[PDB]
Amino acid sequence: EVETFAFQAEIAQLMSLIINTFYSNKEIFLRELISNSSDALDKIRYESLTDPSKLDSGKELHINLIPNKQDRTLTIVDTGIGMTKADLINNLGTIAKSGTKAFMEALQAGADISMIGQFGVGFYSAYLVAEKVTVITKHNDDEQYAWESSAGGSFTVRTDTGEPMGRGTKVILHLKEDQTEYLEERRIKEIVKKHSQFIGYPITLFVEK
């Protein structure tokens, strides 16, 4: 059912650095996650040009931002290519190894945490604001999976039994108690206008009722 994995040593080191460094420019996490969603949308868009049946699992190519004050969660949903079990457990972590090592050397050489995206490890900036991150994903070639980590050196992967998503990735940020500003409509709008004004897919902010 649920399998537990150890993060690659370098990624575990980067995650503890992100969690324990005093750094007030935390809003960068949202730019990084939207950029990752844009890359996944680019991939499915590109593949569909030679195989239009890749869009049978959904033609709409977009990003949704869903704050939820009651649950203290910020969800970023996209209809990109999605991730396989191999991506989640091995392949994305393997590729992230060099970028993680390089990023930590750069930080030691005086670089700022905001440069994280230049090293292909932008995702991990989610741990500036989140105590736990849940990622639900569905790739055309595989089953729906749920990845999760509260850091501490491990992550879990399980087959997801929840609502089918067709194709794409849903990033669920379980925010730290002092990071609730990222659930505010005006705050999300400000961040998106400042960092993500030039993304080639519609970004829809879901207003709470």
Ligand X SMILES: CO[C@H]1CCCN(C(=O)c2n[nH]c3cc(O)c(C(=O)N(C)c4ccc(N5CCOCC5)cc4)cc23)C1
Q: Residues forming the annotated binding site for ATP? A: 36, 78, 97, 123
Q: Is 168 exposed, middle or buried (0-12, 13-18, 19+ CB in 10 A)?
A: buried
Least separation in angstroms between CB 32 and ligand X = 8
Compare residues 35 and 177 and give the one whose CB is closer to ligand X: 35
Residue of 30, 36, 127, 192 that binds ligand X (CB under 6 A): 36
Own/partner long-range contacts of 113-120 (Cβ < 8 Å, ≥24 apart) = 113/18, 113/21, 113/23, 113/25, 113/28, 114/25, 114/28, 116/28, 116/32, 117/28, 117/31, 117/32, 117/35, 120/95, 120/96
Question: Does 88 interact with ligand X (rule: CB under 6 A)?
Answer: yes
Compare residues 113 and 177 and give the one whose CB is closer to ligand X: 113
Question: Does 60 interact with ligand X (rule: CB under 6 A)?
Answer: no
Residue of 17, 19, 89, 92 that binds ligand X (CB under 6 A): 92
Question: Which of these segments, 47-55, 78-86, 178-186, 190-198, binds ligand X (CB under 6 A)?
Answer: 78-86
Least separation in angstroms between CB 198 and ligand X = 16
Round to whole Å and give the CA distance between 41 and 80: 4
Q: Which residue has the tokens 């379980």?
A: 174
Query: Considering only residues 94-133, where is the footprint of ligand X by CB under 6 A?
Result: 120, 122-123
Q: Residue ranges for the binding site?
A: 36, 78, 97, 123
Q: Which residue has the tokens 């960068």?
A: 28
Binding site for ligand X (CB under 6 A): 33, 36-37, 39-40, 78, 80-83, 88, 92, 120, 122-123, 135, 137, 147, 169, 171
